[model samples]
Target: LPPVYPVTVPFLGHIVQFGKNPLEFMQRCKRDLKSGVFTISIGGQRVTIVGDPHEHSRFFSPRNEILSPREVYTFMTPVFGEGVAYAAPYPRMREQLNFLAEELTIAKFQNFVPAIQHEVRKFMAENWKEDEGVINLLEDCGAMIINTACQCLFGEDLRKRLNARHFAQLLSKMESSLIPAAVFMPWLLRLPLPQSARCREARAELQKILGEIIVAREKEEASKDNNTSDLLGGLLKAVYRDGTRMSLHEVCGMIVAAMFAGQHTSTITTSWSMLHLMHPKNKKWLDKLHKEIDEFPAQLNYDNVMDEMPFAERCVRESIRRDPPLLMVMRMVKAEVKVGSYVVPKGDIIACSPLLSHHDEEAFPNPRLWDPERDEKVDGAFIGFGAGVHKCIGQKFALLQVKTILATAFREYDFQLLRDEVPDPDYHTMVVGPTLNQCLVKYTRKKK
Candidate 1:
């Protein structure tokens, strides 16, 4: 029989360890077990973690047929509503991604840099004032991304109609369903408590607003006057193999999916990148990033920014490696699966995470240090946007967006973290970010 995975306590299993500090718990699991696959319990469910990149490719293929990602993310249904992702079948998800990939191609993505840069510049001008003021890095970074996401993914015209603050607020509430109690504790979401009640209201308002925009978009397209080049427009025009157009409900659902695709994850990754850039202890990396910013060729557009700013890319990449956004990507195993020396029996759950492999000493030396140069050593171990076919569909646009904002801020202002020590990860929320009070930073507009 496979050895019972080490647990801190009987029956309780890894509950206290996971609950108290998930990253540390995962480090112990991998270190203590030595085997890449191991079993543990979290939220009263036993799971097998596939903690190696060599094995992660399986997460995309036949192991996929055996493993259901939709099962893990089902918590998003109340927000995505019916006839949408996770709620929809495998083929439908593929269709949506195919349509999205058409828009995210490298050439088409570069065309969007000017608009994305404009959004970042506009955001800094409005929020980052001339005087020094403490800004909550997590919240501001999230807002910055949501604003840019609104402009680039949601369509600029629609964003003008929907206020930025209002857009971020609605999306955050809709995203609340991603949390644990909402996913695992169905009764909590079912109960008429204030959180559940607000979730209902948020979902309703999103459906109404998106439905109206979609119908209006259809009318605009019918006129053949505006061939809007945004993700929403792509969904509106995405034709099926049989020549049928995407339904209004499908279009609306994809917009919300795009928000999650293009917003929440980007927000935290940007926050982590900024945390490393502005940390008082890491001055050399910050200086290298600043050097790249000033030395970059004339007009820091998409090509120059992406190719010229290797260090900038490395910074963001390192941030993701050290502090990935998701807790874990789980799979509900459909068949017996062998990971290294062990066989995970059918009906069991399996999982993988950049969060887990990123800290493996064999893979990365001094795992806690924010080392961008470590990319050369990490070669294939870093799955920042994720791995295989399950990779993030909008990675092209997302990184471009992050790099665009980084270039903008690198030139327009200088930043300093409030404290000398690195801040700890805020675990109170499922989405990773800084604990509000501790992630304090001061910034001032650069003088010409």
Candidate 2:
């Protein structure tokens, strides 16, 4: 078994320190304990973290039976819905994930670039209306993410019925009710909390809206001879292995999961990228970014963002590497597994900390500095999008969406950070991002 970090508080264990500053706490453990693989207790349960870059495969490469994610991700059941994603049986879960993955695949992304650019331009024209004004970069980025995502994923008629404003509120209601603490204290979910009822109402409202859209789409398809090729349509058409189609409940669940997965994550990544680039210290890299996008046309295409924008992609990747939206990825040790010289037993919550691993001094020199040109010294050290079997399927689409926005926004406007430096990562939420209060910025419209 791995060496255990001494627990200060028997019941709470290291949860307080871990919650306050996970990277610092985990790094101290690795240093004092003299091992990258060590155990820390979270509410009496042993949580063994694989913090070594060299031993990442030992955590990510194991099959489901050896290291199952379902047991550790139970807190997400409220948002992803019961019998959906990790809540489902393993085989069915894989199939459901595949269905969602297929919707966001490269083949389906041909129109995404233009759609995203259009939404970005529209949002700027609507909100950034003045010649120069101050705004919360985080809040604006959050809006742009939802608008662009809806533009790319929903059909025109569906968007008419359920606009991004209403969708954002529904998503917020559900997200606000998520108690990530339930992961360690599973009993918390067993209690009938007030927030639980609110979350259910929000989810049911979304489901009902989706059902209305589905019925309307069916009627339209029957009257007219045109087919709708959107995410909802794709999921509704997906067939499971048991020779059956997905139920409405399963379809709604998958859509909620898709939105839930990308909304906070993509928004935070965009906000961080902009903040780092707009800072005075990073003027050199900001100019370099402009040079990359200056050659592109007003309207970007898939080839432009997906293939032609390497530097923009690197900027987005660097932002994610610097402060990954998802701090920790965990799984339950269904069976004993070996990590380096130590063995982890069943019932332990084995986690790979992107927050800890991405900050490894050896893999990333001067980890705090955001340098897009820098490369990881260790292979597979940057698990911002994860690796092996569970790598993020939305990575391609997310990058495309961000790069397109960057090119469109920077080409028409110049941004300046209101603060002395980039905003620090706020670790209060499960999906980590730049501190909202410190993310104010001023945008100046550039004359053509």
Candidate 3:
């Protein structure tokens, strides 16, 4: 087993230091233990962190029977809904993941590029109407993320039934009820609390709303050639090995999971990318992004965002690499697994730290500097979207949405960060992002 970082308090463990600033605490553990791979106790749970980039495959490539994510992420059941994602049996969960992935496949993304650009343009026109204006970039980006995502994934009928703002509020209600600390202190979830009740209410409300949509769609199916092609439609068509279609509960769960997972993470990625690009220090890279997207027509196509913009992609990638929204990817060591020089044993909660790995001096030189042109010094070092079996399925869709927004927004406006430097990452949230207070920015409408 890897050497343990000495427990600060016997029962409490290292949760305090970890909660305050996880990156600093984890790095200190790595430096003091004299090993990149080290163990730390959080609320008496033994968490073995695979901080070495070279050893990432050992953590990511194992079968679920050997290293299971279900146990570590059980806290998410309320948000992902019952019998969905990590809550389901391994095979069924894999099937659900596959179905969700199929929906977001590049083939399905043809109309998504235009849809995203349209929403972004609409949002800017409505929200940033003045010639010069100040807004909280994080808040505005959050709105755009949901609005654009809804445009791409929902049918027009569905959009009319549930607008993006209403949908976002429901998602927020569900998200706010999550107690991520339950991962470390499993007993926290054992009690029936107000948060659990609130979360249940939110999930049920969303399910009811979806049920209404499903009923309307079915009634309309008899009268016309109703097209069932959106994400919800895709999941409805999925049949299990036993030939049973997904239940309404299952379908609603999948949709919630898809939106919940992408909302904060994608919003933060976009926010960070814009914040960095708008900073005066990164003017060269921003200009390079302009050079990449300048040739595209006003209405971007799939080829424009997906294939034509490598620098824009790098800018988004580097933003995520620098400040990964998900700090840790974890699994339960169901069976013994060897990671580099250490052996992680059964019952240990094993994790791969994207935050620590991305900052490895060898893998990413001058890691703090946001260099869009920089490549990983070591292979497989960047795990912002993860690796192996569980790499993020929405990655392509997310990149497409972000790149389009960049091309559309930057084409019409130039932004200036109100801060001297990019806002420091707010490590306080489960999904990390730029500090809200520091995200104030000024946008100027460009003269044609």
lDDT of model 1 at position 55: 68
RMSD over all Cα atoms, model 3: 2.2
Among the numbered candidates, top lDDT falls to 2
Per-candidate total of colliding backbone pairs: 0, 0, 0
Off by over 4 Å in 1: 6-13, 52-54, 57-63, 174-177, 181-197, 200-207, 213-225, 233-250, 296-299, 376-379
Candidate 3 runs further than 4 Å off: 174-180, 190-200, 217-226, 234-249
Candidate lDDT values, in order? 0.69, 0.81, 0.81
**Tens digits of lDDT, candidate 3, 91-177:** 788788777676676677888888888878888988899999999888788777777776677555555555654445644554465
Between candidates 2 and 3, name the one with more favorable lDDT.
Answer: 2
lDDT per residue (tens digit) for residues 1-448 in model 2: 5899987689988889877888799999999999989999988899999989999999899888889888888877766677687887777898877766666766778878887888788889988999999998887887777777767776455455556554456446644655545566666676665486567556667666767666655654556667666777767777778888887766777766776666678888998998888888988999999989898887788888877899999999999999998888999899999999999999899999898999998999899989999999999999999987788888888888888888999999999888887788887776788887998899999997
- What CA RMSD would you report for each candidate? 3.2, 2.0, 2.2
The best candidate in terms of TM-score: 2
Candidate order (lDDT): 2, 3, 1
105 Cα displacement, candidate 1 (Å) = 2.4
What is the clash tally of candidate 3? 0
